Design a binder for these strands. Structure first.
Ligand code: DDS
Ligand code: MG
Ligand code: MG
Ligand code: MG
Ligand code: NA
Length: 538
DNA sequence: GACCACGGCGCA
DNA sequence: TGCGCCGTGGTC
């Protein structure tokens, strides 16, 4: 059992933080284990210097805290990553111990011993799983070191800008609230959907379309209000009000208060075992849902800036998941569109409408996007009729016309579900698996929900695999050029480069990303450079 | 002060 | 399709 600090080489680490965010955490305890023998650090911060590598459960979090302290402690093996590859429903140390053995406690020594035991257990289970092993060695394990650097680096925020924006938005919010109260004939809490439901459907007697899932209230969702956009002018004002309060409560107000005292920057967490499909997620705060789609929303992006003397480089894969779908399905028409360098959404609109290529306006292109994404998500003709604001039968017609233009997409969905029923799981191009139960359920709604999850995963997950692999390849090149990787948003990366290097970094990053893994179609990357995230989008 | 479920909505 | 965070309403 016990033995004196320091631990031997290759030992597994255990640690306890005062809070979940490693950039903010006090390191309460540090221990290590090897051969079941546990070493406990008398003083954790000092002991941190004695480690060569962070090897154990949640290795990346310890590495981030180390980098914060000025120490170069790279994360190595982590049983969480092995478990996540075996089955992406394995998302937490608590859950992994419960499933495979042992107990996740709040004591660093026990956590270190548990890390060692779970590693041996899960490594053995991956014996012979060559494609999952490749993902571990070539994507996930090296990716964790990249993520550690991204987290510790953080991103600079224009706090003064957001403070000013806050005053501006507040004035607009107050104006709209007054108008809404005027139309309703009395004040209420406009932020309470319960109070709004009564006002709209009981007091003003507007027709109530949909109901909410768990409790069966009359919905006030944007989708419901959209269809009432003329049944009363109060609805227009409510939707405007909601857009602004969303921006204010979620981004404008909270973000400026999260600037770190040492770095003077904002630090997110990139969670590596958090999704069913192999995507990353981001939290504390989430920087993967910064507004960008509307003019009002875009203003938030201006707040994300480069260090003095640096620039942001923003790179995004064009129509990434549709290119992946083209590769997986082998559809000749999809592949041809991308091969010919044509715009997939415009080619789709030309076919979905009266054509030709040149006659496709901005409205039609936006409609084609909606149809295309619908296909990816298996969205219903009802949902599509809502989004497009067209009759139900017209949305039905569009979905059928889609599969006429891209027939092998339908065949691919069927092949994917056929094999999924047989094997109990589906997989990405590189062999990342998701176990999807209920593919043969006897209740149609349950079965069909499982089907949509199952055929989407190889697309979403292959795209995630390719992005992760691109990050692993790109990081070392950026290091050699004195540049930094800051953010990933699924199909997009944001880098930071000294001004004099930015052009060279952008050129190299584009080539690394486009060439990450050749497919039946080219991967195209759009790149922009600017002093802020909005202006960088070029 | 802290926890939660729900409806709702931001991004991919 | 996949996420994480918001305020409200409720609770301990
Ligand atoms: N309104 C929406 N609904 C569902 N998914 C959406 C979406 N908007 C985006 N996504 C998802 C799906 C795609 C991904 C990125 O959105 P891009 O805007 O970049 O769509 P892209 O295919 O590249 O078309 P392009 O940019 O040339 O107009 O996020
Ligand atoms: Mg795009
Ligand atoms: Mg984007
Ligand atoms: Mg929820
Ligand atoms: Na239901």
């Amino acid at each position: 059992e016990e033995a004196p600090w320091p631990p031997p080489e290759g030992a597994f680490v255990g640690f306890v933080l005062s809070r979940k965010e490693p950039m903010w955490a006090d390191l309460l305890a540090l221990a290590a284990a090897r051969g079941g023998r546990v070493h406990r650090a008398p003083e954790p911060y000092k002991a941190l210097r004695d480690l060569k590598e962070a090897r154990g459960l949640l290795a990346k979090d310890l590495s981030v805290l180390a980098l914060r302290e000025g120490l170069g402690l790279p994360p190595g093996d982590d049983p969480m990553l092995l478990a996540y590859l075996l089955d992406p429903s394995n998302t937490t140390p608590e859950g992994v111990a419960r499933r495979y053995g042992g107990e996740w406690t709040e004591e660093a020594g026990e956590r270190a011993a548990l890390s060692e035991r779970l590693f041996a257990n899960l490594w053995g289970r991956l014996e012979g799983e060559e494609r999952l092993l490749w993902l571990y060695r070539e994507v996930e394990r090296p990716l964790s070191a990249v993520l550690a650097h991204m987290e510790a680096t953080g991103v600079r925020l224009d706090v003064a800008y957001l403070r000013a924006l806050s005053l501006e938005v507040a004035e607009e919010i107050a104006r709209l609230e007054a108008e809404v109260f005027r139309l309703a004939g009395h004040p209420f809490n406009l932020n309470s959907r319960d109070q709004l439901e009564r006002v709209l459907f009981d007091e003003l007697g507007l027709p109530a379309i949909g109901k909410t899932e768990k409790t069966g209230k009359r919905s006030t969702s944007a989708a419901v209000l959209e269809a009432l956009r003329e049944a009363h002018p109060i609805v227009e004002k409510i939707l405007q009000y909601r857009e602004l309060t969303k921006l204010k409560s979620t981004y404008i107000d909270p973000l400026p208060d999260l600037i770190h005292p040492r770095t003077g920057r904002l630090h997110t967490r990139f969670n590596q075992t958090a999704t069913a499909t192999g995507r990353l997620s981001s939290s504390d705060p989430n920087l993967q849902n910064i507004p960008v789609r509307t003019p009002l929303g875009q203003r938030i992006r201006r707040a994300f800036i480069a260090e003095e003397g640096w620039l942001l480089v923003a790179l995004d894969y064009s129509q990434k998941e549709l290119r992946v779908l083209a590769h997986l399905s082998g559809d000749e028409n999809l592949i041809r569109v991308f091969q010919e360098g044509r715009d997939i959404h415009t080619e789709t609109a030309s076919w979905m409408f009266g054509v030709p290529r040149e006659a496709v306006d901005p409205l039609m292109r936006r409609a084609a996007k909606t149809i295309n994404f619908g296909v990816l998500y298996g969205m219903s003709a009802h949902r599509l009729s809502q989004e497009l604001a067209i009759p139900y039968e017209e949305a039905q017609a569009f979905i059928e016309r889609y599969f006429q233009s891209f027939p092998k997409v339908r065949a691919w969905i069927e092949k994917t579900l056929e094999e999924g029923r047989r094997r109990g799981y589906v997989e990405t191009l590189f062999g990342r698996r998701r176990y999807v139960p209920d593919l043969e359920a006897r209740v149609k709604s349950v079965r069909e929900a499982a089907e949509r999850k199952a055929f989407n995963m190889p697309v979403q997950g292959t795209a995630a695999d390719l992005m992760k692999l691109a990050m692993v390849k790109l990081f070392p090149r950026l290091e050699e050029m004195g540049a930094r990787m800051l953010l990933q948003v699924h199909d997009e990366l944001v880098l930071e480069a000294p001004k004099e290097r930015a052009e060279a970094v952008a050129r190299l990053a584009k080539e690394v990303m486009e060439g990450v893994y050749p497919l039946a179609v080219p991967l195209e990357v759009e790149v922009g450079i600017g002093e802020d995230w909005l202006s960088a989008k070029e």
